[PDB]
Design a protein around this ligand. Structure first.
Ligand SMILES: c1cc(OC[C@H]2CCCN2c2ccnc3ncnn23)c2ccncc2c1
Ligand SMILES: [Mn+2]
Ligand SMILES: [Mn+2]
Length: 363
């Protein structure tokens, strides 16, 4: 019927007809010189209708995402361990998405990257890290229906001193969302994002900074069970003049930093994902064979973390996991950090480049 105070009712049950709510629908940006894109909404309808089941799956996943993040915003507080934050968020996500093997579930581990760490941090077992009042935490989580992934992220703070940094990144992300469209050059989206983000100056503990985009972090095209499908959306000038195409799905995201505006691999790895371009590899090594079978059954090509392997009842798998990485079957995705003492922020939405309109499905 209606959603409970702490959410527990799956999205599927809240919509008995199986028709999930649409995200924000936008007309495409004008075709430079200056031709209108409004014609698409009236043609394109046949091509849009053909993929209705696909858009409907993204919508169910997007509704689960909205209700989980509204729940997260109501209780996330300093003093909580990073493990409890991730477990509370994931328990709600599993329930609302109605987790069912590879058919419905979590598209990737909950990122909760702190301060100079911009992405790919999730605690492993035994991590005693506690969220602090002065922390800047990037909550980045994903849901999927039949591998139709919603990649959506926001930044959590408790100290108002970071307000302008968050506004800079939010404005840069909304710019990217507005600039995106069929036949738009990916380098143009990048330059517009940078121009907006770099117009902001911030003061944190008596020090001033110009907000800079993290040049080696970017938005990207999304494929079925494939978080990155091949096209990169830069967030600085100097990128590639490759164009966005009809029917594509993008994660439009920006990262702002008071640091160097560049990230490097740091800390213990938590995130792993099977390489999409590797076919069948016969393995005789028993622990390695077992772990690969666990990955193929539970995750396929979706990203996973060590906590999820622990949750499945696996143990003493670290060497088997390293073997899969050395064989090129699995790739590690360690935390990406800017310089010590720097602050990073992120905002992200998933968009559908439908033949009729641009739908910000996660908004
Ligand atoms: C850098 C990062 C990648 O994906 C990292 C993925 C997998 C692990 C976590 N992860 C996440 C988590 C949250 N949000 C995300 N948005 C995009 N990816 N992403 C690559 C994928 C494919 N080829 C090149 C790549 C280079
Ligand atoms: Mn993300
Ligand atoms: Mn992303």
């Amino acid at each position: 019927k209606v959603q409970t105070d702490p959410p527990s009712v799956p999205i599927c049950d809240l919509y008995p007809n199986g028709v999930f709510p649409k995200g924000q629908e936008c007309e495409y940006p004008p075709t430079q010189d200056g031709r209108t894109a409004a014609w698409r909404t009236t043609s394109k309808k046949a091509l849009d209708q053909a993929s209705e089941e696909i858009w409907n799956d993204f919508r169910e996943a997007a509704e689960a995402h909205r209700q989980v993040r509204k729940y997260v915003m109501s209780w996330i507080k300093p003093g909580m361990t990073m493990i409890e934050i991730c477990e509370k968020l994931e328990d709600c996500s599993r329930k609302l998405i109605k987790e069912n093997g590879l058919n419905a579930g979590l598209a990737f581990p909950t990122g909760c990257s702190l301060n100079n760490c911009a992405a790919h941090y999730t605690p492993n077992a035994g991590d005693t890290t506690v969220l602090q009042y002065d922390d800047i935490c990037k909550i980045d989580f994903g849901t999927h229906i039949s591998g139709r992934i919603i990649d959506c992220a926001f930044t959590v703070t408790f100290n108002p001193k970071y307000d302008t940094l968050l506004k800079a990144v939010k404005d840069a992300t909304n710019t990217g969302i507005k600039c995106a469209g069929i036949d738009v050059r990916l380098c143009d989206v990048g330059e517009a994002i940078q121009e907006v983000m770099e117009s902001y100056e911030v003061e944190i503990d008596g020090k001033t900074y110009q907000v800079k985009p993290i040049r080696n972090l970017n938005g990207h095209s999304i494929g079925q069970y494939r978080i990155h499908a091949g096209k990169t959306v830069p967030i600085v000038k100097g990128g590639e003049a490759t164009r966005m195409e009809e029917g594509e799905v993008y994660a439009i995201e920006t990262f702002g930093s008071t640091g160097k505006g560049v990230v490097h691999d740091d800390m213990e790895c938590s995130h792993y994902m099977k390489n999409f371009d590797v076919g069948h590899v016969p393995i005789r090594l028993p622990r390695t064979k077992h772990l690969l079978n666990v990955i193929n059954e539970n995750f396929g090509t979706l990203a996973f973390c060590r906590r999820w392997l622990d949750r499945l009842g696996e143990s003493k798998y670290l060497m088997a996991l390293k073997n899969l990485c050395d064989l090129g079957i699995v790739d590690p995705y360690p935390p990406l950090c800017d310089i010590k003492g720097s602050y990073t922020a992120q905002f992200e939405h998933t968009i559908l480049l439908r033949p009729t309109c641009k739908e910000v499905v996660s908004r």
